[PDB]
Every structure is written in structure tokens, then in C-alpha cells.
């Protein structure tokens, strides 16, 4: 009777249901029998009834519920989960909440519907994973994400059952996590997201004063603030940063306080308990800066407390140590260069050290080798410090983090050769020296006047020049192969010499003498002319077009990128300090702005700023 | 013209010349160290030859005496590529923006 | 007097002036110094100047 019952329930007719209870009683057939359930997805009568209905009044639900009650299988029937993959775990309560009908939600909850059921189907998974909609996999979270304040209010406080707001799904995300996940930067979405977030946080704090909801962390270890920062959702992030609660009862959980006003000047005291961490836990600032592929990183960096904190941190110790860094590195490079120049070609390495100059010469090599080893150790410590960032962190951006690794290798590699491979240690030592000299732009990144230059040269080099060089290499290969084939000698050495001559020509110097020996000289000259014309005239200076366009983008965003680079370098410098010293350099005050519910002082670290307003009269 | 040449000269050209001098120092020191004569006068003569090359004239004859000529040519090619191709006319980008 | 003027209350200003409050007293604290020097607000270091800079025509 599955098809007939499905048709009856879909049509919404109530008279047809008459006589079903006697049939079930006589045949002792439960409403959850496999035959009744749809084989495709284990769907039952109730979800079909709730899916299709007229103005939210299908009118068949109470009769079916009474029938199930008479059969004595109400608990199993109401909360029967869907099987299969796409809609696994879905229940009747989720559907009732989705269709925005309060009456059916009340009915299901009163009759005993489970309120903690989790929907884990692939359709409910995040967008990037394959599911078109994600809401935290909970009824209350689903209601909150769909902008239904009345449903959330009723479900939180019900005489039958209550859905605790501090409940985590399989992913670990709680209601706030899901609300942030679906948050969008659109004008309309942000307003309701913030309103629901504030309402839910206030309710949770009111009901449970001891525990703060935002404290809970997901499996990834992030909090709603940290997750919003990582996902690039500025709309909720900025609101969370400057959250202020006027209510006296629950004003403790506020993040922005008022210090004092003198005339147009207003000084306010922000809180940064978790915004800045001295290695104790992950900080919003590090996640915002180091992480890649963030939609609105530049905008999120330009917030009231972030800029002031960066400025104060830079003034306190950043400038003092940055110049020390530059001086030490330049001195080491000068020592390395002097060691490289005064290298005795005569004799088999290693050499005996007996003379006065040996005292000075050996020290340079020892210092350079120890510096390379120190660089390698620093670069492995840093890699493990950031929890082993993947390829995207190293290769695509922060190229200097990789280059010093290469410099770390060669410098020590040569040493091995210097002990056994005496003959050819110079070949790689000189290349290491060149790379070390060339990779000093990391220290120039910080300077405001020349901060952009290094970033934009690194950007253009790998992206524009290589893309152009693909086509240039196509041309080079074709023309060089053609010219090599054409010439008549009357072979590897001849080909190499011809390639050398052609490269010398390509620079713009040399002489055109090859045509004399070859046959068909006229076509040879025609081909050379086409080569020169195409490459030099068009490509050589048409690359400059998009190169200048790239520099134009960098010029348009020069101020924004410099701020990012300066923040990166100062944070970099900070992170290498020991934990105890970092704690000794803590920034902010210990103002006891307010007392807890029991009266104990909060005594939380904060940071005060000030601004000027003239319209506040 | 006068105001903008005075402005660009001290601000753009010097900022670019810092990086250019880093490259120059590194490459020149490397090449001087690499060559085997068998010293101040030799270094000065090599620097003169390398500058004459940097302009775009002169001849590449130094490789004959030195050992490991292939790496020497590779390094010279990297020098020429980087400086001339990228920097020499990428300075022009921000110069034109100024 | 400076505080009374700042809080925009005319009554207390009248009371202090009538009772004999000094009207030429100068405030020279670092907080009152110019912005670039270290003081967040500068108004000439006088009561009348403070009232004028705060847009209080009646007090002036
Ligand atoms: C000691 C503190 C007061 C400051 C600290 N400087 C140093 O420890 C040393 C400098 C020098 C100079 C000559 C010889 C020996 C040393 S030891 C400092 O401020 N930093 C080092 C850690 N940093 C890094 O490791 C970046 C970011 O992770 N990676 S890197 O590109 O590979 C790099 C950059 C510069 C230096 Cl140099 C070493 C490295 Cl692997 C950042 C910046
Ligand atoms: C335009 C650019 C970006 C692409 C070309 C890459 C260069 C690095 C190539 C172009 C021509 C090449 C040269 C062509 C011929 C030779 C000679 C070869 O050794 C010889 O002198 C041959 C004599 C012999 O072996 O008997 C060593 C490499 C070198 C300099 C090659 C090294 C690499 C060069 C400079
Ligand atoms: C790219 C630019 C902006 C930076 C380089 C600065 C130039 C002014 C340097 C580059 C090479 C230098 C030259 C390298 C070698 C010499 C030879 C030296 O005297 C000699 O002829 C050496 C012979 C001897 O003393 O026995 C006088 C300076 C000169 C021309 C140097 C003078 C200054 C030069 C041209």
C-alpha cells in the first residue's frame, strides 16, 4: 500500500486515511515497515507530508501522528532518519524548521521529536566539499542560520525539551561557528547575522553565567573570531572586535569599553585578550597575516585596534632590532665576500694554516659555515613553529623563506667538498655567495621608501617574465634549430659554438660572420632578420607593456601592500624571540574595568586608543 | 621638466640603485673571486671590463683564462638577464608613474 | 572653572564666577599641549578660549 498511501498523503486528502488503523491492527503492520518506506532513500510518510503542503497546513500530520501513537511506535516513526548518502541523517524536525512553520515544530517537539539529531549528508556539507548548503548540522543551528528568531527562541526554552547552545557537531562547529560559516559580506546578510549572533550570545550568557560561549573551540582548534578572520568575513569580524554591551547584568563579555572623554577627544579602551598572544595560543593577527588566499585581508587589517597595536609594537622594539639585523647580516656578507676573494687556488684543499694571515682567513670560513648552519636551524624551527605550513606558504609567496634554505644547503655542501671534493668547491661556493647577496631584499621589505620594490620585483619575475619566456623560448628553440640545421660544415662542439655566437648576437654585440660558410645565405639573413625583428622590436618591449601594468597595479595599491609587508616583517622579528622575553614585552594594561557576577575582578589585558569627533554635541 | 627630473633623480633612481648596487656588488665579487690568475690592479682592470660590458659594448674574453668557464657564463647570463631585461626597464614603470 | 566650562553647564559657571573663581587661570599640563607635542587637546590654556573652542556661544 506504499504507492496509494504516498499518493494520498501527497494530495493532502484526509478522508482516504480512514480505515488505515483497523488495517494496521488486523495485519499488525508497523508504519516503519520496509515496504512502506521508500527504497530510494528510506523516506517515510511524515517527511513526504511535510515536503509538500498547502500554505503550511497539510492537515494530514495530526492524523498520522495519532495513528502512530495508537500503533505504539511514535518515537521510532517521528525521528526516523534518512538513509543513503545525499540526505543522510535528515529528520522531520529539520524539514519542519526549514519550511518556516512554527506549528509543526511545536507539534513534533511536544510529541517527542529528537532535537539533537545531526544531518551529515553530502548535500549538507560545505560548498567547497560538495554540499550546496551548510548550517552546522543541528536543528537550532539551522533555525539560526535561516533568520527565524521566533523558532530559535521557542526551541531554546521549551517545557518539553531544550537545545543547549553549547553543542558541537561532528566537525566541532557550534551555533556561532555555523552562523559565521554562512555569514556573507552582503549588506542584508551581515545585519541579520550580527543580530542573531548577539541575541544567541546574550541568551547563552544569561542562562549560563559561568561559561562563555565563544570559549568553545572546534576540532580545528579555532574560535568564531579566529574562523571569521581565517575565512575573510569582515562583516562579522569587525562587529565582534568592537562588541559593546550596554546591559549592566551581562556587560562583562563586551570587548570595547569607554575610558574617558575630554571635549572632542574621546579615548576608548579595547580588549585584546585573544587578539594578541605571546605564544600561549594562536592569535588573530598571525592567522590574518600569514595565511594565504584571504578575500579581504587588506580591509580586515585596517581596523581600529590592529593598526595601533602594530604601531606600538614596531615602536617598542621593532626598529631597535631591525637595524641590528641589517648590520649583522651585511657584516657577515662582507666577511663572506672577503673570504671568497682571498681563496688560494694553488694547492689541494684543505690547506695548512701556519702564517699570520691564516688566523684571519680561517675565521671567515668558520663564521660563514656556522651562520649557514644557524640559518638552516632557524628555518626548520620556523617551519615547525607554524605547524608545518605546506607548499602554498613557501613556494607561492614569502620566497625569501625558501631562498635562505637553498643558501643554507650550498654553504654547507661546499664544506663537504672542501674536505674531499677539493677541486670544485669554488663552483658552488661562489653561487652560494651570489644567492646570499641577491636575497638581501627581505631586509629592504621593511623600509617604507623601498618596501614595494622587493615585493613587486619578486612578483613580476616569476609570473610575468616566465610567462613571456615561454613564448620567447619557443621562438629561440625554433630559430636556433633552424639555423643550426641550415649551415653546411663542409658536431656537438660546432653546435655549441654556434649557439654561443647566436647568444652574443642576441645581446646586441658580436659580428655576423656565419653566413660566409653556409649555403643559401640570403634565406639565412632573411631568417635572422625575422628573428631580430620579432623578438627585439615586438616582444622585448611589449613585455614592458604588461610589466608596467603590473607596476601600475602595485602603484595603485602601494600603501596597502607596504602596510602588510611591514606588519609581516615586524611579526616575523617578534616570533623568533624566546617565550619569557616575549612575555616580558607584553603590551597593554591590566585595567579592572568590571567585576564578575560574584563580584570578583576580571583583570583582563586591554589596550587604549583615542580619536577626535566634532559632531557629538 | 626641471622639477620632475630633480624629483625623480633623488627619490626613484636612488631607491632603484640600492637594489642595483646589491646586485652589482654580489656579482662582481663572485666573478672576481672565481677567476684564477695562474691583485688590486687585476681587480680594477676586471671591474673596468665588466662595466664596459654593462654598458652594452666590449668583448667577452675573460672566460678563457678562468677555470669553470661554463658556470662563469651562466652567472654572466643571469646578471645580464636580471639587470637589463627586468630592472633596467622596470624602473621605467614607476618612473612613468611619477 | 575649566571643568565647569567643559561640561557645558552654565549654572555652575555662573556660580563659580560669582563666588570669586579666577578667570585668567592657565592650564599648562602636558595633556593640554598641542597634538604633535604630546597633548591630545589644545585650546589656548584659558577659560574663555576653552569655551570658544568648544562651540558654546552663550558661555562666551
Ligand atoms: C636575533 C633577533 C634579535 C632578531 C632575529 N635575527 C636573528 O636571529 C639573526 C640575524 C643574523 C644575521 C647574521 C648572522 C646570523 C644571524 S641570526 C630576527 O629578527 N629574524 C630571524 C628569524 N627570521 C626568519 O627566520 C625568517 C622568517 O621566518 N625566515 S628567513 O627568510 O629564511 C631569514 C631571514 C633573515 C635571517 Cl637573519 C634569517 C632567516 Cl632564516 C626573521 C627575522
Ligand atoms: C634568453 C635566455 C633567458 C635563455 C637562454 C639560456 C642561456 C643560459 C643559454 C643561452 C646560450 C647558452 C650557451 C650556449 C653555449 C655554451 C658553451 C658550453 O661550453 C662550450 O664552450 C662548448 C665548447 C666545447 O665543449 O668543446 C657551455 C654553455 C654555453 C655558454 C651555454 C650556456 C647557457 C646559455 C648562455
Ligand atoms: C652602475 C653605476 C651607477 C655604479 C658603478 C659606479 C661607477 C662610477 C664605477 C663602476 C666601475 C668603476 C671603475 C672600475 C675600474 C677603474 C680603474 C681605476 O684606475 C685604473 O685604471 C686601474 C689601473 C691601475 O691602477 O693600475 C680608476 C677607476 C675605474 C675607471 C673605476 C671608476 C668608477 C666606475 C666606473
Residue numbers in the entry:
A (entry chain A): 150 to 639, 662 to 788
B (entry chain D): 602 to 639, 662 to 721
C (entry chain D): 242 to 301
From the paper:
TRPV4 is a polymodal, calcium-permeable cation channel that has emerged as a potential therapeutic target in multiple conditions. TRPV4, expressed in the plasma membrane of a wide range of cell types, is a polymodal ion channel whose gating is controlled by multiple endogenous lipids, and exogenous stimuli including synthetic ligands, cell swelling, shear stress, moderate heat, and ultraviolet light. Human TRPV4 adopts a two-layered homotetrameric architecture where RhoA attaches to the bottom layer. RhoA appears to act as an auxiliary subunit, interacting with the ARD through three loops connecting AR2-AR3, AR3-AR4, AR4-AR5, and with the membrane bilayer through the prenylated C-terminal tail.
Particle subtraction followed by focused 3D classification of the transmembrane region and RhoA-bound cytoplasmic domain were performed, resulting in improved map qualities for these regions for model building. In our ligand-bound 3D cryo-EM reconstructions, we identified strong and unambiguous EM densities corresponding to GSK279 (antagonist), GSK101 (agonist), and 4α-PDD (agonist) located at a shared site within the cavity between the VSLD and the TRP domain (termed here the VSLD cavity). We functionally probed the interactions of GSK101 with TRPV4 by mutating amino acid residues within the GSK101 binding site using patch clamp recording on HEK293 cells expressing WT as well as mutant TRPV4. Mutations Y553A, N474A, and F524A significantly increased EC50 values of GSK101 for TRPV4, consistent with observations from the structural analysis. The GSK101 binding pose remained stable during the simulations, supporting its accuracy. However, in the GSK101-bound open state, the SF and the PHs move closer to enable cation coordination (the diagonal distance of G679 backbone carbonyl is 7.0 Å), which is consistent with previous mutagenesis studies. Meanwhile the pore-lining S6 helices rotate ~90°, thus changing the gate position (from M718 to I715) and the gate opening (the diagonal distance at I715 is 8.3 Å). This S6 rotation between the two states is due to the shift of the π-helix position on S6, resulting in a local secondary structure conversion between α- and π-helix along S6b, which is unique amongst the TRP channels. To validate the S6 gate position observed in the open-state structure, we performed Cd2+-dependent blocking of TRPV4. Among cysteine mutants near the S6 gate (I715C, A716C, L717C, and M718C), only I715C showed substantial inhibition of GSK101-elicited current by extracellular Cd2+, supporting the observation that I715 faces the ion permeation pathway in the TRPV4 open state.
